[PDB]
Design a binder for this molecule. Structure first.
Ligand SMILES: O=C(O)C(=O)Cc1ccc(O)cc1
Ligand SMILES: [Fe+2]
Length: 210
């Protein structure tokens, strides 16, 4: 559905497998990059951001090489900026990316790092960073916690890394596990509930432009 999109599985080359989700004008993908993969640099008109979830990655961008750490660093490739990658480990890299034709002014950094903060709506501790066209928030949803009803001005895409989370968007409800996402367009009512006995790690991306 629009709010709980079904991914399309793609194999991009012998090294890269993707689960591709459409979120109106944003594409969200979960990636699996093979052990020791070299990914040739490419460019495209879509701006791109992403993070490693498991493993490690090296970003090749603007004639420098930047390491990317799991659940910490976000790579940022503005429109038509040439970017490539190496997986420096003999383990697969599991990650995600978002791609979107952006209107915003250029990003000042090719790598951003999450830092400790507080989630506005819930007042729960989180780690976050804000970029030129996006904000990424990672946070633990405690066992039993109810994410209160909220209508955001900004589009939001989210997913979890472990456990099972109940998510309601506008007029539709699903239990989410890792491998699925939710998409909440601007102004839709969203709420959620961790009915499991474990703390759930949630990542959300707010799209700052329309
Ligand atoms: O999917 C994208 O746009 C990426 O940026 C990941 C990527 C980069 C370079 C390649 O040669 C293949 C895949
Ligand atoms: Fe790319």
């Amino acid at each position: 559905s629009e709010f709980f999109p079904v991914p399309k599985p793609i194999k991009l080359n012998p090294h890269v497998e993707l689960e591709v989700f459409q979120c109106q004008d944003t594409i969200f993908q979960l990636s699996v990059i093979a052990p020791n993969a070299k990914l040739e640099s490419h460019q495209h008109p879509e701006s791109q951001i992403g993070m490693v979830l498991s493993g490690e990655l090296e970003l090749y961008i603007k004639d420098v090489i930047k390491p990317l750490r799991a659940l910490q660093d976000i790579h940022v490739a503005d429109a038509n900026v040439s970017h490539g990658f190496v997986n420096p480990l003999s383990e697969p890299m599991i990650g995600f990316d978002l791609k979107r034709i952006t209107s915003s002014l250029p990003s000042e950094d090719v790598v951003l790092t999450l830092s400790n903060n507080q989630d506005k709506i819930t007042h729960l501790p989180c780690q976050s960073v804000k970029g030129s066209w996006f904000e990424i928030v990672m946070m633990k949803i405690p066992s039993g916690y109810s994410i209160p009803p909220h209508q955001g001005e900004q589009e939001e895409i989210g997913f979890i890394l472990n456990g099972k989370l109940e998510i309601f968007i506008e007029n539709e409800e699903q239990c989410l596990e890792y491998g699925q996402i939710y998409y909440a367009p601007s102004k839709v009512l969203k709420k959620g509930y961790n009915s499991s006995n474990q703390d759930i790690n949630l990542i959300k991306i707010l799209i700052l432009e329309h």
